Ligand SMILES: Cc1nc(-c2ccccn2)nc(N2CCN(CCO)CC2)c1Cl
Ligand SMILES: [Co+2]
Ligand SMILES: [Co+2]
Ligand SMILES: [Co+2]
């Protein structure tokens with residue numbers, strides 16, 4: 415394997431972290447290959463769940479808890495902290511909230527959150543590498559509570575970063591918020607990618623194509639598939655009661671990705687930097703409710 419940039423994995427990984435039996439587990443938690451049979455039973459279906467009030471309460475709770483866990487991770491970002499250490503804090507924070515860390519053993523993913531440094535687009539596996547001053551790093555958190563998953567991510571600065579890093583992260587955040595502003599009943603899922611790419615392109619950035627936003631509720635990833643690039647073939651129209659994510663991955667250079675030998679880590683083929691932000695959204699009548707929003711501060715961590 416020829417690496418695309420300066421990043422390398424730092425092994426060994428500490429042994430898989432257990433989750434006390436008292437915490438309710440998703441179907442895939444105990445599957446030998448971490449396959450989710452409830453998800454697989456809906457593979458290739460484009461029909462979107464309309465959530466009940468019970469479902470909405472469940473989503474509101476789990477998404478609030480997920481935000482709390484992301485905030486825990488935010489507090490730990492500093493030079494010299496390893497991504498495994500962030501993951502350990504995340505793991506314990508989920509457990510403290512009587513939640514299962516959704517990524518853990520999801521299709522055999524070995525950790526409890528994804529840590530995506532610099533050229534890693536998404537699905538970076540927490541390991542022994544200490545964060546370095548100048549790095550940018552995304553932590554993507556998902557929690558499972560009472561049958562419901564809640565999912566968000568933010569990109570962070572490690573110490574002082576360069577102008578390019580600031581522009582990339584700022585622009586990525588803007589793409590997400592411009593797409594969210596457009597969410598309301600009657601809007602086609604395929605429109606969001608038009609908005610996101612318009613803004614990314616205007617700032618000299620490209621939009622990752624291989625990874626998309628997604629339905630989430632009783633399943634971790636489900637209909638609708640939500641591309642972040644222009645002129646996509648996404649199936650569906652937003653309706654009150656739909657829950658899904660928007661999670662644009664944006665790059666300094668080209669949009670092409672490839673995966674490391676670990677089967678997870680997705681990196682820019684050109685080794686330039688990528689950034690991502692993500693919210694879980696509920697479509698209402700005036701627009702939408704940002705379920706994973708901060709409740710106690712106006713802005714994402716990188717501005718604050
Ligand atoms: C966006 C996405 N993320 C993950 C993931 C996985 C591990 C940790 C964090 N995220 N998985 C996704 N999948 C994985 C397997 N799928 C079924 C095909 O085998 C599609 C949903 C998808 Cl579609
Ligand atoms: Co993912
Ligand atoms: Co996520
Ligand atoms: Co997501």
Ligand SMILES: [K+]
Pocket residue numbers: 530531532533534535536550551552687688689690
């Ligand atoms: K990154």
